[PDB]
């Protein structure tokens, strides 16, 4: 009976493959044969933030496009005013092994997590004027690799085992648990409407989950190696992933297949962070060879290179108004580019 | 700058000052990543102190030691092992009762071979190019009856000489020693220990002092 189920699953995979082949009448690279290229993008370092003293592993922008969180390999989660290079907060973490950051859309809460398997949510706006651990979310088995805020009540976390969770904050138990991956869920990204989200794991595949319904909608394959970063398109119908194959890949939700492969022969090392610019034209991807390339999301040619970091880039983010790009690297400085 | 902007700059400078003292306090503190082939001998290494990763903060001779155990992580370790790139040293726990007890499967993939594979994946890692290993052999009292009841035949099919403790333990130590490839940039110290010895912290302090003075000779540009 097990062999019959395996053969039926193989037939289903073949059916998915031929449906994707039938729906693929053309390519995006074929259509973008007469479109105007972006030219060369000259992004220079407007600000540098020289406060951390260890390797920065995460960074997240506030929705006001001004405040930054950044976590390093001390107990330090620093909140910066990026306009005036000013530290507005320095939250001391109980565990220095932090691999992720989150800034709430309201800006009240900041989440952290990492090798300590728990998600600490800090309330910034308290009557006592300090930062307090508003919540301590436990229940994940592996290391917490990514966390994103839906709103002030709910948070979606991705762990180092084959699960993702949607939690509640006033009651610290998980609202739902998404379990369809086979591998360590290394990245997680939310739609702008926050109704669906894509999680990318170590099985070289991304999955699109519905937050309210609680089950997988689509599974996207194509990557040779495990993927480390996913960002949605600003339209919300597409997303680009980056792996250790040195290839970004733009998948589309409604086509249920990949559209583009951003690759170059000069780059061979993996991709750590991927973020779209506003309107979804540029694609800033940070690599392991100390650089940060800018691709065009429509045609696979490369724009300028954000080469200013002395170590590898671990996180990169674009503001909600698209003003500037903050790249946090493995040296202690994170640089703001425009 | 306005009045509130000047006061915010003053607050940021005070944050810079306190953060610099916190970083200087954290700098004078050695980090030991404690790895092992499951629950074999790590319990005793925690036991002469005197969730996922667990951190112990013992001290010895006015030196603060932070020892991290990640045996409860139980995931694919290549994604998070770069967080321990800046540790002072890698303590490795290998049980000498690992052979002849397979403990995982029916007949294959015994404990000594997976301990070998974990050691080879750790000492030849791309991040641990220069960190040293303070590899332990945690079963001294149990090894003599293990080699008395059974020869070293179910692993290392080559001869171990005889069934006495000294040359067999030297064979285990030598076969763990030649496993690394970068013989120059890192060293394995290979202490032998039991569950009653209290000299583990002295050998750890000696290896830590060697790593510190080698890092200082790196820092002064003379190594």
């Amino acid at each position, epitope marked *: 009976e097990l062999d019959q189920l395996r053969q039926e699953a193989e037939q289903l995979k073949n059916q998915i493959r031929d449906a994707r082949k039938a729906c693929a009448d053309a390519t995006l690279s074929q259509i973008t044969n007469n479109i105007d290229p972006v030219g060369r993008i000259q992004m220079r370092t407007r600000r540098t933030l020289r406060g951390h003293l260890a390797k920065i592993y995460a960074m997240h922008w506030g929705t006001d496009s001004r405040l930054l969180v950044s976590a390093s390999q001390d107990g330090k989660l620093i909140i910066w*005013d990026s306009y005036t290079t*000013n530290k*507005v907060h320095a939250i001391p973490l109980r565990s220095s092994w932090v691999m992720t950051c989150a800034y709430a859309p309201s800006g009240n809460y900041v989440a952290c997590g990492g090798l300590d398997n728990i998600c600490s949510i800090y309330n910034l706006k308290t009557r*006592e*004027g300090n930062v307090r651990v508003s919540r301590e979310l436990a229940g994940h088995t592996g290391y917490l690799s990514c966390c994103r805020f839906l709103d002030d009540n709910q948070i979606v976390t991705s762990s180092g085992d084959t699960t993702c969770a949607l939690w509640d904050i006033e009651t610290g138990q998980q609202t739902t648990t998404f379990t369809g991956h086979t591998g360590d869920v290394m990245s997680l990204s939310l739609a702008p409407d926050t109704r669906l989200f894509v999680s990318g794991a170590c099985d070289a595949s991304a999955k699109l989950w519905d937050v309210r319904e609680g089950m997988c909608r689509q599974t996207f394959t194509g990557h040779e190696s495990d993927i480390n970063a996913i960002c949605f398109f600003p339209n919300g119908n597409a997303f680009a992933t980056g792996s250790d194959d040195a290839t970004c890949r733009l998948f589309d939700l409604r086509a249920d297949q990949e559209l583009m492969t951003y690759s170059h022969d000069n780059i061979i090392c993996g991709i750590t962070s991927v973020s779209f610019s506003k309107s979804g034209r540029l694609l800033l991807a940070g690599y392991d060879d100390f650089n940060c390339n800018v691709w065009d999301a429509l045609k696979a040619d490369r724009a300028g290179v954000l080469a200013g970091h002395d170590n590898r880039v671990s996180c990169l983010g674009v503001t909600d108004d698209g003003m500037a790009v903050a790249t946090g690297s493995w040296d202690s400085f994170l640089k703001i580019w425009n | 700058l306005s*009045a509130e902007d000047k006061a*915010a700059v*003053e*607050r940021s400078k005070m944050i810079d000052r306190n953060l610099r003292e916190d970083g200087e306090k954290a700098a004078r503190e050695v980090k030991l990543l404690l790895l092992g082939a499951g629950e074999s001998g790590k319990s005793t290494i925690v036991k002469q102190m005197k969730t996922g990763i667990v951190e112990t903060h013992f001290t010895f001779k006015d030196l603060h030691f932070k020892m991290f155990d990640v045996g409860g992580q139980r995931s694919e370790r290549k994604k998070w092992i770069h967080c321990f790139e800046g540790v002072t040293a890698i303590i490795f726990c290998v049980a000498l009762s690992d052979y002849d007890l397979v403990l995982a499967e029916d007949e294959e993939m015994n404990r000594m071979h997976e301990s070998m594979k974990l050691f080879d994946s750790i000492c030849n890692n791309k991040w641990f190019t220069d960190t040293s290993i303070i590899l332990f052999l945690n079963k001294k009292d149990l090894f003599e009856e293990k080699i008395k009841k059974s020869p070293l035949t179910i692993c290392y099919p080559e001869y171990a000489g005889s069934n006495t403790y000294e040359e067999a333990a030297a064979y285990i130590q030598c076969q763990f020693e030649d496993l690394n490839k970068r013989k120059d940039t890192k060293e394995i110290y290979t202490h032998f220990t039991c569950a009653t010895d209290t000299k583990n912290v002295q050998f750890v302090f000696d290896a830590v002092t060697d790593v510190i003075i080698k890092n200082n000779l790196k820092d002064c540009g003379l190594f």
Partner: single-chain antibody, 226 residues
Framework: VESGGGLVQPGGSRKLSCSAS????????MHWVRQAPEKGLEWVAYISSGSGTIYYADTVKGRFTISRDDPKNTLFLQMTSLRSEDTAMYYCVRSIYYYGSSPFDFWGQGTTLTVSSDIVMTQATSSVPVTPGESVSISCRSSKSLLHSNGNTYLYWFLQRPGQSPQLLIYRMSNLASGVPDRFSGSGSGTAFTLTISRLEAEDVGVYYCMQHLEYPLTFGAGTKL
């Protein structure tokens, strides 16, 4: 909370002492603004976070000395030379200064002791009808336009209910504080500022003060009692 201080003295020297209760006193700048029994509020002294920059008013520059002790969370104002001008309720104020902060948010209970250039804030209106449920508006004018280059006017509106300490209503132009209802708004730009009330209850009566925060010898607005 915070309270404590001194009492009546003829022409002597006194150390006012207030004790902070559980709001991380070391990270808060502290003001010592004072209020005469029939006049309005006026600013006296300021100690910053970690005893850094210290500011005084133009009349108490040498006579007064403000200090803090982060052990026991205590604040001192030592006055050596005492005149007949400074018989007042002395109203200790906390204020934290970061980007999204709301300074002057919490005020001490105030202790009364009897002895026996700058921006001039007018507030020409002083009395309005006390009827509830209406929409009363309170205007404010300054001498210099307190619009800074970063784009926010540093003008604050406080409510002093008759009987207790004044409470911050809005901490910029159109920046509602915490714990204040949504019936207030800033609606000011440049020099003219216009606080407005949607509906008046019995708890909205009191004296309304406007305070600039552009340059540090900061002046209040002499009150507009409803």
């Amino acid at each position: 909370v915070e309270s404590g201080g001194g009492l009546v003295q003829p022409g002597g020297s006194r150390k006012l002492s207030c004790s902070a209760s559980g709001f991380a006193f070391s990270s808060f700048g502290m003001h010592w603004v004072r209020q005469a029994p029939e006049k309005g509020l006026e600013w006296v002294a300021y100690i910053s976070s970690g005893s850094g920059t210290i500011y005084y008013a133009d009349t108490v520059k040498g006579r007064f000395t403000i200090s803090r002790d982060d052990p026991k969370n205590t604040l001192f104002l030592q006055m050596t030379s005492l005149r007949s001008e400074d018989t007042a309720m002395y109203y200790c104020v906390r204020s934290i200064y970061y980007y999204g902060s709301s300074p002057f948010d919490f005020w001490g209970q105030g202790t009364t002791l009897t002895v026996s250039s700058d921006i001039v804030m007018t507030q020409a209106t002083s009395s309005v009808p006390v009827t509830p449920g209406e929409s009363v508006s309170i205007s404010c004018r300054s001498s210099k336009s307190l619009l800074h280059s970063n784009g926010n006017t540093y003008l604050y509106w406080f409510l002093q209910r008759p009987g207790q300490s004044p409470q911050l209503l809005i901490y910029r132009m159109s920046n509602l504080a915490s714990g204040v209802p949504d019936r207030f708004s800033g609606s000011g730009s440049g020099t003219a500022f216009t606080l407005t009330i949607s509906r008046l209850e019995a708890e909205d009566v009191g004296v309304y003060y406007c305070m600039q925060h552009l340059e540090y010898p900061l002046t209040f607005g002499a009150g507009t009692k409803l």
